[PDB]
């Protein structure tokens, strides 16, 4: 029968998996199979990131950041739906 | 003194100046038996490992190598010369002579200070660097 590895190696293995995924993603992006990650922006970061470009057309910029928020939330919700039993 | 690498003939010191590009060559010309030269050939011992990244120290006995006495004025008992990429780096002290440190000092921090200042001014591409401390006196009082 199997054995139950302890919480220390639980955290260690989780860290290995996440670092593995991050490095693989970064190597793929350096290759260019996906575009470089666009900076995740919120309402609080709206004028920090895009403010200079957000002065000219503020409503377009807030629409774009809210679209990014909606895309993230939709990715989460449909990820749960795909993982739904 | 005896621990640091030694150069025996004229060709070796010129090669040691030429065989390096990314550090500073600090040559202690003099006689390792001199009370003056032995005073600072232990300071150069105590910091040889510390300055390995940007400095290499060779020792030369002018009697063993009587080829640079006339050209570089090797007549003070002890002399220190800094070379960078086959270029003698002049250094401005408080003393009148601005080509050498012709006296043996005592503090292991000030010599690393001078060597690092020489390296910093030599990466830029200068020929004369300026020491932090002033040696127009001895700060004794």
């Amino acid at each position: 029968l199997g054995v139950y590895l302890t919480k220390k190696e639980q955290k260690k293995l989780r860290r290995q998996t996440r670092r593995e995924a991050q490095k693989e993603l970064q190597e793929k992006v350096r290759l260019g199979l996906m575009p470089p990650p666009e900076p995740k922006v919120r309402i609080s970061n709206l004028m920090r990131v895009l403010g200079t470009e957000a002065v000219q057309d503020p409503t377009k910029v807030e629409a774009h950041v809210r679209a990014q928020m909606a895309k993230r939330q939709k990715a989460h919700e449909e990820a749960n739906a795909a993982r739904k039993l | 003194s005896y621990m640091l690498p030694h150069l025996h003939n004229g060709w070796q010191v010129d090669q040691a100046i030429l065989s390096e590009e990314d550090r500073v060559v600090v040559i202690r010309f003099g006689h390792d038996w001199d009370p003056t030269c032995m005073k600072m050939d232990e300071v150069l011992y105590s910091i040889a490992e510390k300055v390995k990244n940007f400095a290499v120290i060779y020792l030369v006995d002018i009697t063993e190598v009587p080829d640079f006495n006339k050209m570089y004025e090797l007549y003070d008992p002890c002399t220190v010369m800094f070379f960078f990429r086959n270029k003698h780096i002049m250094i401005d002290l408080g003393t009148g002579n601005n080509n050498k440190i012709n006296w043996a000092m005592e503090d292991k921090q000030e010599m690393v200070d001078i060597i690092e200042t020489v390296y910093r001014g030599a990466r830029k591409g200068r020929g004369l660097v300026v020491s932090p401390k002033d040696y127009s006196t001895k700060y004794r009082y």
Binding site: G2, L5, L13, R19 | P5, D32, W33, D34, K52
Partner: protein, 81 residues
Amino acid sequence: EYLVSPITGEKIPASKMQEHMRIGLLDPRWLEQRDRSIREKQSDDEVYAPGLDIESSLKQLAERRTDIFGVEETAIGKKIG
């Protein structure tokens, strides 16, 4: 005796499962620091002289400083007197 590996799900000997868990989770980035500093010291060049050079320099220094070495005292820079 057979156990099941918690990480790979494969039959393993019960005697090894301890060091199996010690080593199967060996952190991958550890390998470079094991294989990086050793290369640095392999390519590193010495700072002090070889021991024979210290011996020879000590002999040469003893040749001059008769106020310490030898039995026939002479001047500081003189070979013998």
